[PDB]
DNA sequence: ATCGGATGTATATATCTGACACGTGCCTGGAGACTAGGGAGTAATCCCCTTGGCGGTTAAAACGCGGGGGACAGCGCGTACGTGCGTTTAAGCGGTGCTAGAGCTGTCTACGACCAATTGAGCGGCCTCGGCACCGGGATTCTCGA
């Protein structure tokens, strides 16, 4: 009997072994769903994307393969559903997002 | 000591999202931060509807339910619609 | 003859390269000082890591750059490009810090 | 050892180019040691609360995550430090 | 039964009434369906949110302790309702 | 000769006893509609307690004249005595709901 | 066979033993120090005794014996410790603190 | 259905501080729901922190600790010296 | 700055009452007693991050130095807002009546729990090399006096 990880028959990428793990350890139910770390993992993997692809956005609009942490602060501050998510978190190496008011401009 | 990340499967989705780019490993352990800032959020949050709910059993449905009450909007939409067909896959075998 | 931009003009495009940059801009040691100094109090002699104290300081001077620039659109509603330590005082208020 | 006044070793530059950083163009003096205080009280929680996780952690060093679970509690979350 | 334009049921007294429990003495008209928006907008949240609950509850009804419970998620927790 | 208290003293006077009263200032009625006409937008025909009610209105009023209480700080940062949309925005901003 | 519960062990009145049931049908950790819900129960006790002890203060100043939850409102927003603690909490029938601002006082 | 509260402990209380003054049920339920308030907070707050120490039990250490995290100053050092005499006054059981 | 009048508000009174303090019988969670495991506690070891110092640099801070720029104070007006009084209006009491749906009990069953046997997905560690950071230099564009 062959071991392939469920995640193969999910079809996704992060290890759901080590979702389950987390999740019996982590005292949050007496036992945990079968297909719920599966949902939730996809939840994840989906967030990712949108957020590292984002990233990728801001990183070559800055004409930069390696991504630093500035674009994904930038893409972050430039997401509003995200943002709301996100604007209680602080970002390291995060900077601000360039807002310029108003009054301040010069005539 | 076996200290355990998803900075691979960071690398991973990212070449699935854009093969040509590169990463900070500050970068990446701020992603893996924020990783584990939502899978906790969305733990507690479906423990305590369970615990609403008396429920010792967490599953999909409280799953969806907890990240709408979390993510907003169309990030709530697709989230759950990912996470529906990914189940459904899995299930399917 | 000797030539002076107008005022604010430099410090404009300072703002401008400050959004730009993203590093810190507090020198480490001075803040490193000052968070032991703030430890003994609580506990003397408390050792850290570099990577803790650099958290401190960038967590610390992202949540002043929020006070800043919310004091600031607090003293755009002041009608005024001078800030007053009022407006600080009030933002915090608002900002339930009182 | 003891350490003291360190909180005037925060600079009038230093608290400019913050101000400049949040876009701000004119500022006045009374802001500036207004300014540090406000610091010092913010920091005045985090610090203790951080040390008392490190008190229950029944260690002599501080560390990050630490000011993590803090800011987590204090609701104001960073990334970046595991 | 469909509903509608209950936004505007609020009467402007019963928005200055609650101006002057806030401690308000001089109002302008342009803030009161502003302000009505605003109400919306918060309301728009946690009705949801609390059906959200009752969603998972698989009820019909919608009970207190849902909104308690948004609340509280909305960290603007009340209390007296169990 | 008709007597007419002069302006705001009459309105103060509320501001007075409103302070000094505890109960709500909405109509339940019209709230309850507005509840109710809010909810079919998420889903139709859904029933609640008028304790859950209660716990809205009331809840919602606190939110409200909490709002009212800093905005009518900020406009006495903004030096009037009226009030002003910009007030509450802006106060709504600082208090990140924007 | 002589009966004696925890809390008289402890002379208080907190049920020890029913909160320690609570705290295990809690899921927050597997198993748990005998005396921290004696410890809890106490802290409860604590301050339940603060904020009551204010709230009939706030009653008697009415001439009110049965303590009304604008008691409990002026207490909490009274005490600078216990304010900060319920800051961002709210109250059923709870209004508001009597407070005028400078300006508001016509001159 | 029987349902468990406090108001019998809450009016104890309130007897042992004022045996004069009465009390509502709406505060009273008020009280309640307080207090369940803030035994989830110290709860989740001690857990937390036991899963940071990964400890699986839970003493009074984390107790203490956790409360001094929630009491604003002089609160939590008055509370934790009753709570101290209770464990004492249950350790000298 | 005062007095007179208007008005609004704190008080005593009376009674009504319905929450509310109080007491019950009955229930089960809490106490009491007993067993196991194993999380926690202690200790010796290693490492190794930190805390300490030392010297050279300059970018940065301190300080000074006009000086235009706006904070601010004042001053006119006017429009928008309190107000008191009109008007009409849904709000609230209340009481009726139906039931849809919470809300409870009784199954029975699929479903993780759990353990055991197996291992390859993953992680610490080791090269490696190329975007990237820095630098110098040239060309571009804003800005302040015509």
Known sequence: ??????????????????????????????????????????????????????????????????????????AVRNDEELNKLLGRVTIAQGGVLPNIQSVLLPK | TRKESYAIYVYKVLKQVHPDTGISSKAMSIMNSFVNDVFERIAGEASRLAHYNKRSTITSREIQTAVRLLLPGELAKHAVSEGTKAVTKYTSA | KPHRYRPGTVALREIRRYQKSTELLIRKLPFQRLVREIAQDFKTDLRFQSSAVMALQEASEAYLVALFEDTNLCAIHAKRVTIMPKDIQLARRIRGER | KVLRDNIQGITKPAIRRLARRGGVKRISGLIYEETRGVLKVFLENVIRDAVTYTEHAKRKTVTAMDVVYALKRQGRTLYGFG
Chains 1, 7 share one sequence.
């Open chain 1, 1 to 74: 009997a062959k071991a392939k990880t469920r995640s193969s028959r999910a079809g996704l990428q992060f290890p759901v072994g080590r979702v389950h793990r987390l999740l019996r350890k982590g005292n949050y139910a007496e036992r945990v769903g079968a297909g719920a770390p599966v949902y939730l993992a996809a939840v994840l993997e989906y967030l990712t994307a949108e957020i590292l692809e984002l990233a990728g956005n801001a990183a070559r609009d800055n004409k930069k393969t390696r991504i630093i942490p500035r674009h994904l602060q930038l």
